Amino acid sequence: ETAFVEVVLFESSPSGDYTTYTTGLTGRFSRAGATLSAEGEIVQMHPLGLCNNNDEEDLYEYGWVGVVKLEQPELDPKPCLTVLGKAKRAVQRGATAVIFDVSENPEAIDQLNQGSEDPLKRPVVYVKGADAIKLMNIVNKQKVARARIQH
Amino acid sequence: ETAFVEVVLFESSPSGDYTTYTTGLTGRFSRAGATLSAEGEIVQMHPLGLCNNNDEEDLYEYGWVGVVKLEQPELDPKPCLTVLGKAKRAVQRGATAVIFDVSENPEAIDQLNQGSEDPLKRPVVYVKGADAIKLMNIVNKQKVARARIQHRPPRQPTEYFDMGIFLAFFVVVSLVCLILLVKIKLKQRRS
Amino acid sequence: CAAPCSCDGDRRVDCSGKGLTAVPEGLSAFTQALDISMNNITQLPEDAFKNFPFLEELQLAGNDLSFIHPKALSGLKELKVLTLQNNQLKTVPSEAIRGLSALQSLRLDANHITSVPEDSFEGLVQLRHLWLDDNSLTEVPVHPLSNLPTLQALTLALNKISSIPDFAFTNLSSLVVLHLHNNKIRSLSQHCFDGLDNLETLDLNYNNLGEFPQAIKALPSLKELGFHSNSISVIPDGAFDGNPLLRTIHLYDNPLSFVGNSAFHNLSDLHSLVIRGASMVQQFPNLTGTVHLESLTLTGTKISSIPNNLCQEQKMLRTLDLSYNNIRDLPSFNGCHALEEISLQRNQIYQIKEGTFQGLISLRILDLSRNLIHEIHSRAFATLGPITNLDVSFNELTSFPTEGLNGLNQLKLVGNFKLKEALAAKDFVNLRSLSVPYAYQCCAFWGCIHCTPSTGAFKPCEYLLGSWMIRLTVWFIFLVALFFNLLVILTTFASCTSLPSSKLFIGLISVSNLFMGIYTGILTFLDAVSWGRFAEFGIWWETGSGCKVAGFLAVFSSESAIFLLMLATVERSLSAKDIMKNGKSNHLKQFRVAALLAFLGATVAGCFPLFHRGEYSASPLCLPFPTGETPSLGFTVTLVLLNSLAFLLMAVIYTKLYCNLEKEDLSENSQSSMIKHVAWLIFTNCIFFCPVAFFSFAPLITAISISPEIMKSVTLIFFPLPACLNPVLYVFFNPKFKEDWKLLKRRVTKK
Amino acid sequence: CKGCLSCSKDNGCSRCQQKLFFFLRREGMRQYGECLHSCPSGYYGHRAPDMNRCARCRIENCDSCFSKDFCTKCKVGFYLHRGRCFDECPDGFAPLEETMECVE
Ligand SMILES: *[C@@H]1O[C@H](CO)[C@@H](O)[C@H](O)[C@H]1NC(C)=O
Ligand SMILES: *[C@@H]1O[C@H](CO)[C@@H](O)[C@H](O)[C@H]1NC(C)=O
Ligand SMILES: *[C@@H]1O[C@H](CO)[C@@H](O)[C@H](O)[C@H]1NC(C)=O
Ligand SMILES: *[C@@H]1O[C@H](CO)[C@@H](O)[C@H](O)[C@H]1NC(C)=O
């Protein structure tokens, strides 16, 4: 059930061709989503960004792999939505895959892998440790990147 | 080596949500590309569009699933680039995958599947027959669609389970043989 | 453009965050926009802005301002925007802002204002926008507001206003937007809104309104009206008579109980109508005139019938949600050409006619779960278009139509236990996700489509036993056990002599074992009959009485064998004591009665799952040992704990008798053969019972995971392995059987 | 982490001060929180007891909006009238070109 996440970087050469650098990662397919292979453009989403019910502000194109870094639970005493609800909302907004950084919220794996009778059609992956910090650095340093979740 | 292709159609609701309709398809992973899984926005693409070496007119974003419809070789007596060359050029232009429609030219199947030492890092799929015409109808009828090529690993890996089954069968047979040998040994000793 | 103030060529000066304590000096005399926000100016001295005659926009946000001199803003005759939010002002500076004859936008939010002087806002004849929210106001400043006839937008949210008096807004004719959310408003006088003829947006969310605000009838130009998160319970008839131009009404999160029948009639511009929890409503609302509805939602009510002309009136209807009601008969949905999503779950629909869903060319998602549907017309889905999601789960279905279903992506039928037939896989070309009451219906679709429940190893599709090795092993066990058990039974019970307890117990274990042999024979015969086509037979076998009979036979045989072994070991130990204790054992009748008691206990143990439902139907093998259930786990853990306690009891008894046994006492005594035979029997039985026990204990430990085929194979190969093994030891290792067989041969030859 | 109560390096601010606005800034592929004393252009402040959040001006043809459906000023070529942007002043109202809105 392990997931291999590949991060790709572009540089549009003047002649027109593309050269790619790939960086490896490792996550785990959460039980909240199917264990399929997905791919798309990485778009970080704030944990509070999935709260809003007015999606007209952030109409994204279909097929964006969302990266959400969960924060420590005491900093959010009252949540608007559970992690499953946040993932389902992201899938509603056109995300082809959802990646959660659960380093600061070790219970997220618990409420994700928990027995749910309504699995999501798209994969849900969580990362932690060196992989999570590497992915977050890639997110907050490079201008654009594309993720390739494989099974 | 079977390839499963899903074609997704978007309908942006005014509220901001997306509604999807997926159409199934089946193709075959060619030996000229890796048997991976790919996904990206479908982009129709003329076979002669790769002939030009001026890429400035074709600056697409990275990660687009290319769809190429071949034609009769009679109308193209001198193909400037072979099918493998076209796949390589499409990949160089940032295509995450290439889906060929080889129904018109069946020789492209053996041209892609021939023994070559230069496979491409991205999957190369070929489709033919009713599947090809269905995919062509979707691509030239709907405006924008997203393809999802899934490798779909083969039938369940019953290797280790089969070894365990043979282990159990061998244990049973060895137990039977041991019991038989013990009984004949005891018979000889008593005799 | 003197430092530290940033300055551009558009006469705009920015000095935010420079830590200034007073207004900057040396700036251009032609400055038009000055920004000194985020600074530390805690007081504005007199005539502090006498160097900017041409100022137009001024910002003082986040300055911790506390006192403004009355002459501080003197000479600002061209000021248009003045912001003073996020400060420490406690009273509105009426004296200071009196001279701003050209002000158009004033901000006073995020302050600690408690009282507005009666003479405030005098001279602000050009004011258009006023901010007053997030303050400590306790009442509407009627008189100060009366001096602003040109006001267009006013906000008073996040305050401590309790009620609105009559004619609180008699002036302010040009008002358009009024905000009052997150207040403590509980009472609105009848004429509180009189004079607001131009008002379009009224906000009253998060308040304490108990009754409906009848005063809104004096707002002919209202377009949006939100009072959600309130305490409104009853909406009377003709509540929106005075607002014919309503577009949206926010009324969710309310303790709604009853809604007037004619409350939402006319209202030709209303777009959405969502009412939930109105449990005292019995009739469908009278929506005549309302032709612009694009979404309807009436859940949690007692509505029983849908009017026929619903599709004729609401031409532009898009989504229709009518769940949690008492709807019995569905009308003709013909004419709802724009309908996309229909939700009707948790209702009392008992049938679907042919013409129910005729003309829904745009239908995409249809929900009918948790109803009483017992019959669906074969052509009921002939006229559907791009239908992608269908849900008929938890119903009384017996057969499912398939015509026109080729476009489906997701289909749900879980809970239709009466649905035994298999769905044809050729009518669901585009299906991707499926749910069925029984996993055996999923066999056809898989092309080895994420369908549930998964057809795991414990629920095979093609072959019941599985691998040919396992099939051969089970066949061999069956034949060996059957033949050897008949041989042993005939030999032991073919002599009309007094039967000692040892021989009687051996024969009793043999006849008990015969039933496990019969169970294995049933398994092999069922597998042979259903070779390759077990999917068809699986549902009938599991739900039928055959699985119950096989499971009862298996459980009864196992438990009777175990209890018989217990009683045999106890008898052996007691007789060993009696050998030098009395020299004669006289417990024949008592031991026979105890054996009968053990047999009856085994019968009751086997019959226990029969009263329960689903215990024997977990697997086609009909064994209680599950893949994980909550009741079956309890039954299996009870049974296995009893068996393990039995095993340790016999083990300790045997060790005790061995310790009390003298080494030289086994040289030539006849009971030595019997005690060795019993030792070997308990040896093999205890060894072979461990794997089943440990695999039944496996799901209780989450750290270890085993693929289903492993436990399936080991249970098929190990549960009846003692069955074939037990008589082999007696026949080939007990010298007494030799004399017994000779006596039987002599009897046969004599007869 | 300016004017922030709980800040992180990846998500920026997660909870602003009491009387401050929490605005989510989209910078290409990276999104993070931010606290401002007033919502930026194209957004309107919405006061609330648990947190104040910026929201996009949903009124079409608008630059700065007082509320969800009230525009203080539209772009060039459009006329202010009761918080609505009109390419021409309706009947009974004459355009004013100097400061760009409808007048009587
Ligand atoms: C603002 O000015 C006051 C009054 O002089 C002073 O006590 C306070 O420290 C200043 N705050 C700053 C510089 O942040
Ligand atoms: C406000 O309305 C009242 C009642 O009609 C009127 O007497 C008063 O003059 C009005 N005030 C202004 C400033 O227009
Ligand atoms: C429904 O509304 C129409 C139009 O207002 C009215 O004529 C009719 O009497 C109403 N019907 C009921 C049953 O209230
Ligand atoms: C709605 O009100 C108008 C007058 O404003 C009237 O002509 C019309 O009949 C009414 N319609 C309904 C359905 O009540």
Side-chain angles (χ1 to χ4, degrees), chain C residues 502-548:
Chain C
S502 48
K503 251 196 189 178
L504 168 156
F505 264 81
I506 290 320
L508 215 30
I509 305 186
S510 293
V511 47
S512 150
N513 201 284
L514 190 63
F515 294 141
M516 171 85 78
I518 287 192
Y519 158 80
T520 32
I522 270 175
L523 274 196
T524 88
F525 267 174
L526 180 61
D527 174 89
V529 162
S530 79
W531 162 258
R533 322 174 286 100
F534 182 67
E536 301 174 4
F537 292 99
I539 313 169
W540 155 76
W541 172 249
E542 276 191 331
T543 67
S545 53
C547 197
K548 298 176 182 180

Short mmCIF file of all heavy atoms in Angstrom, two decimals, chain C residues 502-548:
data_model
loop_
_atom_site.label_atom_id
_atom_site.label_comp_id
_atom_site.label_asym_id
_atom_site.label_seq_id
_atom_site.Cartn_x
_atom_site.Cartn_y
_atom_site.Cartn_z
N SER C 502 -12.01 -48.04 27.79
CA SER C 502 -11.02 -47.62 26.80
C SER C 502 -11.49 -47.94 25.38
O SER C 502 -11.47 -47.08 24.50
CB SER C 502 -9.68 -48.29 27.09
OG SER C 502 -9.85 -49.68 27.31
N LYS C 503 -11.91 -49.19 25.14
CA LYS C 503 -12.38 -49.58 23.82
C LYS C 503 -13.63 -48.80 23.44
O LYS C 503 -13.78 -48.36 22.29
CB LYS C 503 -12.64 -51.08 23.78
CG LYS C 503 -11.65 -51.88 22.96
CD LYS C 503 -12.19 -53.26 22.66
CE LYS C 503 -11.13 -54.15 22.03
NZ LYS C 503 -11.64 -55.52 21.78
N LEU C 504 -14.56 -48.64 24.39
CA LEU C 504 -15.77 -47.88 24.11
C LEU C 504 -15.44 -46.45 23.73
O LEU C 504 -16.03 -45.89 22.81
CB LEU C 504 -16.70 -47.94 25.33
CG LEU C 504 -17.93 -47.02 25.44
CD1 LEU C 504 -18.94 -47.67 26.37
CD2 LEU C 504 -17.59 -45.63 25.96
N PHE C 505 -14.48 -45.84 24.43
CA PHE C 505 -14.12 -44.46 24.13
C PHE C 505 -13.42 -44.35 22.78
O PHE C 505 -13.64 -43.39 22.04
CB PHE C 505 -13.25 -43.89 25.24
CG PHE C 505 -14.02 -43.10 26.25
CD1 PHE C 505 -14.71 -43.74 27.26
CD2 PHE C 505 -14.10 -41.73 26.15
CE1 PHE C 505 -15.43 -43.02 28.19
CE2 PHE C 505 -14.82 -41.01 27.07
CZ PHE C 505 -15.49 -41.65 28.09
N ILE C 506 -12.58 -45.33 22.43
CA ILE C 506 -11.95 -45.31 21.12
C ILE C 506 -13.00 -45.40 20.02
O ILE C 506 -12.98 -44.62 19.05
CB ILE C 506 -10.91 -46.44 21.01
CG1 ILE C 506 -9.70 -46.15 21.90
CG2 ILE C 506 -10.47 -46.62 19.57
CD1 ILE C 506 -9.27 -44.70 21.90
N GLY C 507 -13.94 -46.33 20.16
CA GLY C 507 -15.01 -46.44 19.18
C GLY C 507 -15.87 -45.19 19.13
O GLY C 507 -16.35 -44.79 18.06
N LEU C 508 -16.09 -44.56 20.28
CA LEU C 508 -16.91 -43.36 20.32
C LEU C 508 -16.22 -42.20 19.61
O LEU C 508 -16.86 -41.45 18.87
CB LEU C 508 -17.22 -43.00 21.77
CG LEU C 508 -18.60 -42.39 22.05
CD1 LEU C 508 -19.61 -42.91 21.05
CD2 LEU C 508 -19.04 -42.69 23.47
N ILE C 509 -14.91 -42.05 19.82
CA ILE C 509 -14.16 -41.05 19.06
C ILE C 509 -14.21 -41.36 17.58
O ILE C 509 -14.29 -40.45 16.74
CB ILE C 509 -12.71 -40.95 19.57
CG1 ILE C 509 -12.67 -40.68 21.07
CG2 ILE C 509 -11.95 -39.87 18.82
CD1 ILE C 509 -11.29 -40.43 21.61
N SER C 510 -14.17 -42.64 17.22
CA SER C 510 -14.23 -43.00 15.80
C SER C 510 -15.56 -42.61 15.17
O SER C 510 -15.59 -42.03 14.08
CB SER C 510 -13.98 -44.50 15.64
OG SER C 510 -12.64 -44.82 15.99
N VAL C 511 -16.68 -42.90 15.84
CA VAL C 511 -17.97 -42.55 15.26
C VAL C 511 -18.15 -41.04 15.24
O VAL C 511 -18.73 -40.48 14.30
CB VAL C 511 -19.13 -43.25 16.00
CG1 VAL C 511 -18.99 -43.14 17.49
CG2 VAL C 511 -20.48 -42.70 15.55
N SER C 512 -17.65 -40.34 16.26
CA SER C 512 -17.64 -38.88 16.22
C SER C 512 -16.86 -38.36 15.02
O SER C 512 -17.29 -37.42 14.34
CB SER C 512 -17.05 -38.33 17.51
OG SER C 512 -16.41 -37.09 17.27
N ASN C 513 -15.71 -38.96 14.76
CA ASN C 513 -14.86 -38.55 13.65
C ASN C 513 -15.50 -38.83 12.30
O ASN C 513 -15.20 -38.16 11.30
CB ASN C 513 -13.52 -39.27 13.77
CG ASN C 513 -12.43 -38.58 13.03
OD1 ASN C 513 -12.36 -38.66 11.81
ND2 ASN C 513 -11.55 -37.91 13.77
N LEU C 514 -16.36 -39.85 12.25
CA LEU C 514 -17.06 -40.17 11.01
C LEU C 514 -17.84 -38.97 10.48
O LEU C 514 -17.95 -38.79 9.27
CB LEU C 514 -18.00 -41.35 11.24
CG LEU C 514 -18.62 -41.93 9.97
CD1 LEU C 514 -17.52 -42.46 9.09
CD2 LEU C 514 -19.62 -43.02 10.31
N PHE C 515 -18.37 -38.13 11.37
CA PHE C 515 -19.14 -36.98 10.92
C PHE C 515 -18.26 -35.88 10.35
O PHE C 515 -18.67 -35.20 9.40
CB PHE C 515 -20.00 -36.46 12.07
CG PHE C 515 -21.07 -37.42 12.50
CD1 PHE C 515 -21.37 -37.58 13.84
CD2 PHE C 515 -21.75 -38.17 11.57
CE1 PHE C 515 -22.35 -38.47 14.24
CE2 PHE C 515 -22.73 -39.07 11.96
CZ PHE C 515 -23.03 -39.22 13.30
N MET C 516 -17.05 -35.70 10.88
CA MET C 516 -16.11 -34.80 10.23
C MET C 516 -15.72 -35.33 8.85
O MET C 516 -15.58 -34.55 7.89
CB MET C 516 -14.86 -34.61 11.09
CG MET C 516 -13.75 -33.86 10.41
SD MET C 516 -13.93 -32.08 10.56
CE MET C 516 -13.36 -31.86 12.24
N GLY C 517 -15.55 -36.64 8.74
CA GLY C 517 -15.33 -37.23 7.42
C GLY C 517 -16.48 -36.96 6.47
O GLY C 517 -16.28 -36.67 5.29
N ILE C 518 -17.71 -37.05 6.98
CA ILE C 518 -18.89 -36.76 6.16
C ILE C 518 -18.89 -35.30 5.72
O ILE C 518 -19.23 -34.98 4.58
CB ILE C 518 -20.17 -37.12 6.94
CG1 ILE C 518 -20.34 -38.64 7.01
CG2 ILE C 518 -21.39 -36.48 6.29
CD1 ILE C 518 -21.71 -39.08 7.49
N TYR C 519 -18.51 -34.40 6.63
CA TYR C 519 -18.42 -32.98 6.27
C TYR C 519 -17.41 -32.75 5.16
O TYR C 519 -17.68 -32.01 4.20
CB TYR C 519 -18.06 -32.15 7.50
CG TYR C 519 -17.45 -30.82 7.14
CD1 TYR C 519 -18.25 -29.75 6.77
CD2 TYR C 519 -16.08 -30.63 7.18
CE1 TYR C 519 -17.69 -28.53 6.44
CE2 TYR C 519 -15.52 -29.41 6.85
CZ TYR C 519 -16.33 -28.37 6.48
OH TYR C 519 -15.77 -27.16 6.15
N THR C 520 -16.23 -33.37 5.26
CA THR C 520 -15.25 -33.22 4.20
C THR C 520 -15.76 -33.79 2.88
O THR C 520 -15.52 -33.21 1.81
CB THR C 520 -13.92 -33.87 4.58
OG1 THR C 520 -14.16 -35.00 5.42
CG2 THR C 520 -13.05 -32.87 5.31
N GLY C 521 -16.46 -34.92 2.94
CA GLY C 521 -17.05 -35.46 1.73
C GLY C 521 -18.06 -34.52 1.10
O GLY C 521 -18.11 -34.37 -0.12
N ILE C 522 -18.87 -33.87 1.93
CA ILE C 522 -19.80 -32.85 1.44
C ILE C 522 -19.03 -31.74 0.74
O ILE C 522 -19.42 -31.29 -0.35
CB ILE C 522 -20.66 -32.30 2.60
CG1 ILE C 522 -21.93 -33.13 2.76
CG2 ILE C 522 -21.01 -30.84 2.36
CD1 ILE C 522 -22.76 -32.73 3.95
N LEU C 523 -17.92 -31.30 1.34
CA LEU C 523 -17.13 -30.24 0.73
C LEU C 523 -16.61 -30.65 -0.65
O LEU C 523 -16.75 -29.91 -1.62
CB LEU C 523 -15.97 -29.86 1.64
CG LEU C 523 -16.25 -28.81 2.71
CD1 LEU C 523 -14.94 -28.27 3.26
CD2 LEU C 523 -17.11 -27.69 2.16
N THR C 524 -16.01 -31.84 -0.74
CA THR C 524 -15.45 -32.27 -2.03
C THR C 524 -16.54 -32.47 -3.07
O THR C 524 -16.35 -32.14 -4.24
CB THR C 524 -14.61 -33.54 -1.89
OG1 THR C 524 -15.45 -34.70 -2.02
CG2 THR C 524 -13.85 -33.57 -0.59
N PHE C 525 -17.69 -33.03 -2.67
CA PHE C 525 -18.76 -33.23 -3.64
C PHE C 525 -19.32 -31.90 -4.15
O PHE C 525 -19.57 -31.75 -5.35
CB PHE C 525 -19.87 -34.09 -3.04
CG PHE C 525 -19.71 -35.56 -3.31
CD1 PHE C 525 -20.55 -36.48 -2.73
CD2 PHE C 525 -18.71 -36.01 -4.16
CE1 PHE C 525 -20.40 -37.83 -2.98
CE2 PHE C 525 -18.55 -37.35 -4.41
CZ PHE C 525 -19.40 -38.27 -3.83
N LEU C 526 -19.50 -30.93 -3.25
CA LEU C 526 -19.96 -29.62 -3.67
C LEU C 526 -18.95 -28.96 -4.60
O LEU C 526 -19.32 -28.33 -5.59
CB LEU C 526 -20.23 -28.73 -2.46
CG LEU C 526 -20.71 -27.32 -2.80
CD1 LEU C 526 -22.02 -27.38 -3.56
CD2 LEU C 526 -20.86 -26.49 -1.54
N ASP C 527 -17.66 -29.08 -4.28
CA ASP C 527 -16.63 -28.51 -5.14
C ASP C 527 -16.63 -29.16 -6.52
O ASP C 527 -16.51 -28.48 -7.54
CB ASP C 527 -15.26 -28.65 -4.49
CG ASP C 527 -14.14 -28.20 -5.39
OD1 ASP C 527 -13.79 -27.00 -5.35
OD2 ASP C 527 -13.61 -29.04 -6.14
N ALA C 528 -16.77 -30.49 -6.56
CA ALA C 528 -16.77 -31.19 -7.84
C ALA C 528 -17.98 -30.81 -8.68
O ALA C 528 -17.86 -30.61 -9.90
CB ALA C 528 -16.74 -32.70 -7.61
N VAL C 529 -19.15 -30.71 -8.06
CA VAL C 529 -20.35 -30.32 -8.80
C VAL C 529 -20.21 -28.91 -9.36
O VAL C 529 -20.54 -28.64 -10.52
CB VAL C 529 -21.60 -30.46 -7.91
CG1 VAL C 529 -22.76 -29.66 -8.49
CG2 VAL C 529 -21.98 -31.92 -7.76
N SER C 530 -19.70 -27.99 -8.54
CA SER C 530 -19.56 -26.58 -8.91
C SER C 530 -18.17 -26.25 -9.43
O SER C 530 -17.69 -25.12 -9.25
CB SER C 530 -19.91 -25.69 -7.72
OG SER C 530 -18.84 -25.62 -6.80
N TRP C 531 -17.50 -27.20 -10.08
CA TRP C 531 -16.16 -26.98 -10.60
C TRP C 531 -16.16 -25.88 -11.65
O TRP C 531 -16.69 -26.06 -12.75
CB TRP C 531 -15.60 -28.28 -11.18
CG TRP C 531 -14.44 -28.07 -12.11
CD1 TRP C 531 -14.46 -28.10 -13.47
CD2 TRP C 531 -13.08 -27.82 -11.74
NE1 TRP C 531 -13.21 -27.88 -13.97
CE2 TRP C 531 -12.34 -27.70 -12.93
CE3 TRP C 531 -12.41 -27.68 -10.52
CZ2 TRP C 531 -10.97 -27.44 -12.94
CZ3 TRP C 531 -11.05 -27.42 -10.53
CH2 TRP C 531 -10.35 -27.31 -11.73
N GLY C 532 -15.57 -24.73 -11.32
CA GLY C 532 -15.43 -23.63 -12.24
C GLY C 532 -16.59 -22.66 -12.27
O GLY C 532 -16.43 -21.54 -12.77
N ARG C 533 -17.75 -23.05 -11.74
CA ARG C 533 -18.94 -22.21 -11.76
C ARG C 533 -19.49 -21.98 -10.36
O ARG C 533 -20.71 -21.89 -10.18
CB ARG C 533 -20.01 -22.83 -12.66
CG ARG C 533 -19.47 -23.49 -13.91
CD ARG C 533 -20.57 -24.21 -14.68
NE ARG C 533 -20.98 -25.44 -14.02
CZ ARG C 533 -22.05 -25.57 -13.26
NH1 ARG C 533 -22.86 -24.55 -13.03
NH2 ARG C 533 -22.32 -26.75 -12.71
N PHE C 534 -18.61 -21.90 -9.37
CA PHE C 534 -19.06 -21.78 -7.98
C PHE C 534 -19.79 -20.47 -7.71
O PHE C 534 -20.51 -20.37 -6.72
CB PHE C 534 -17.88 -21.92 -7.03
CG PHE C 534 -18.28 -21.85 -5.58
CD1 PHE C 534 -19.05 -22.85 -5.01
CD2 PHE C 534 -17.89 -20.78 -4.80
CE1 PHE C 534 -19.42 -22.79 -3.69
CE2 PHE C 534 -18.26 -20.71 -3.47
CZ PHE C 534 -19.02 -21.72 -2.92
N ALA C 535 -19.62 -19.46 -8.57
CA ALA C 535 -20.30 -18.19 -8.35
C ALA C 535 -21.81 -18.36 -8.38
O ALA C 535 -22.53 -17.76 -7.57
CB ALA C 535 -19.86 -17.17 -9.40
N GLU C 536 -22.32 -19.18 -9.30
CA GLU C 536 -23.76 -19.41 -9.38
C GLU C 536 -24.27 -20.11 -8.13
O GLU C 536 -25.33 -19.75 -7.60
CB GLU C 536 -24.09 -20.23 -10.62
CG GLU C 536 -23.66 -19.58 -11.93
CD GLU C 536 -23.88 -20.49 -13.12
OE1 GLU C 536 -24.43 -21.59 -12.94
OE2 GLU C 536 -23.49 -20.10 -14.24
N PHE C 537 -23.55 -21.11 -7.64
CA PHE C 537 -24.01 -21.91 -6.51
C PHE C 537 -23.75 -21.26 -5.16
O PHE C 537 -24.32 -21.71 -4.17
CB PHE C 537 -23.33 -23.29 -6.53
CG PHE C 537 -23.75 -24.16 -7.68
CD1 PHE C 537 -22.95 -24.26 -8.80
CD2 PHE C 537 -24.93 -24.87 -7.62
CE1 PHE C 537 -23.33 -25.07 -9.86
CE2 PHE C 537 -25.31 -25.67 -8.68
CZ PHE C 537 -24.51 -25.77 -9.80
N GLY C 538 -22.91 -20.23 -5.11
CA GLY C 538 -22.46 -19.73 -3.82
C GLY C 538 -23.58 -19.14 -2.98
O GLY C 538 -23.70 -19.43 -1.79
N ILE C 539 -24.41 -18.30 -3.59
CA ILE C 539 -25.48 -17.64 -2.85
C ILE C 539 -26.49 -18.66 -2.36
O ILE C 539 -26.92 -18.63 -1.20
CB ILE C 539 -26.14 -16.55 -3.70
CG1 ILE C 539 -25.07 -15.68 -4.37
CG2 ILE C 539 -27.04 -15.69 -2.85
CD1 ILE C 539 -25.62 -14.76 -5.44
N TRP C 540 -26.89 -19.59 -3.23
CA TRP C 540 -27.86 -20.61 -2.84
C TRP C 540 -27.30 -21.50 -1.74
O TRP C 540 -28.03 -21.89 -0.83
CB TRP C 540 -28.26 -21.44 -4.06
CG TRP C 540 -28.74 -22.81 -3.69
CD1 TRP C 540 -29.94 -23.15 -3.16
CD2 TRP C 540 -28.01 -24.04 -3.83
NE1 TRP C 540 -30.01 -24.50 -2.95
CE2 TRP C 540 -28.84 -25.07 -3.36
CE3 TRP C 540 -26.74 -24.36 -4.31
CZ2 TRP C 540 -28.44 -26.41 -3.36
CZ3 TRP C 540 -26.34 -25.68 -4.31
CH2 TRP C 540 -27.19 -26.69 -3.83
N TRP C 541 -26.02 -21.84 -1.82
CA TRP C 541 -25.41 -22.69 -0.80
C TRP C 541 -25.34 -21.97 0.54
O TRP C 541 -25.72 -22.53 1.57
CB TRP C 541 -24.02 -23.13 -1.25
CG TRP C 541 -23.25 -23.84 -0.20
CD1 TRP C 541 -22.14 -23.39 0.45
CD2 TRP C 541 -23.51 -25.15 0.32
NE1 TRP C 541 -21.69 -24.33 1.35
CE2 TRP C 541 -22.52 -25.42 1.29
CE3 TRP C 541 -24.48 -26.12 0.07
CZ2 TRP C 541 -22.48 -26.61 2.00
CZ3 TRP C 541 -24.44 -27.30 0.78
CH2 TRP C 541 -23.45 -27.54 1.73
N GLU C 542 -24.86 -20.72 0.54
CA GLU C 542 -24.68 -20.00 1.80
C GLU C 542 -26.01 -19.67 2.45
O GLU C 542 -26.19 -19.91 3.65
CB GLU C 542 -23.86 -18.74 1.56
CG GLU C 542 -22.36 -18.97 1.54
CD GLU C 542 -21.57 -17.68 1.57
OE1 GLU C 542 -22.09 -16.66 1.06
OE2 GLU C 542 -20.44 -17.68 2.09
N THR C 543 -26.95 -19.12 1.69
CA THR C 543 -28.23 -18.75 2.28
C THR C 543 -29.14 -19.96 2.50
O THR C 543 -30.11 -19.86 3.26
CB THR C 543 -28.95 -17.73 1.40
OG1 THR C 543 -29.32 -18.34 0.16
CG2 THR C 543 -28.04 -16.54 1.13
N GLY C 544 -28.84 -21.09 1.86
CA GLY C 544 -29.65 -22.28 2.01
C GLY C 544 -29.34 -23.04 3.28
O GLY C 544 -28.47 -22.68 4.07
N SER C 545 -30.09 -24.13 3.47
CA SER C 545 -29.91 -24.97 4.65
C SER C 545 -28.70 -25.88 4.55
O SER C 545 -28.26 -26.41 5.58
CB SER C 545 -31.17 -25.81 4.89
OG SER C 545 -31.52 -26.53 3.72
N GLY C 546 -28.15 -26.08 3.35
CA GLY C 546 -27.00 -26.96 3.21
C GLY C 546 -25.79 -26.46 3.98
O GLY C 546 -25.10 -27.25 4.63
N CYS C 547 -25.53 -25.16 3.91
CA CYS C 547 -24.42 -24.60 4.67
C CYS C 547 -24.64 -24.76 6.17
O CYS C 547 -23.71 -25.06 6.91
CB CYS C 547 -24.22 -23.13 4.32
SG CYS C 547 -22.61 -22.48 4.83
N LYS C 548 -25.88 -24.55 6.62
CA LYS C 548 -26.18 -24.74 8.04
C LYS C 548 -25.92 -26.18 8.47
O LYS C 548 -25.31 -26.42 9.52
CB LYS C 548 -27.63 -24.36 8.32
CG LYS C 548 -27.95 -22.90 8.03
CD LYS C 548 -29.43 -22.61 8.23
CE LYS C 548 -29.76 -21.17 7.88
NZ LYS C 548 -31.21 -20.87 8.08
#
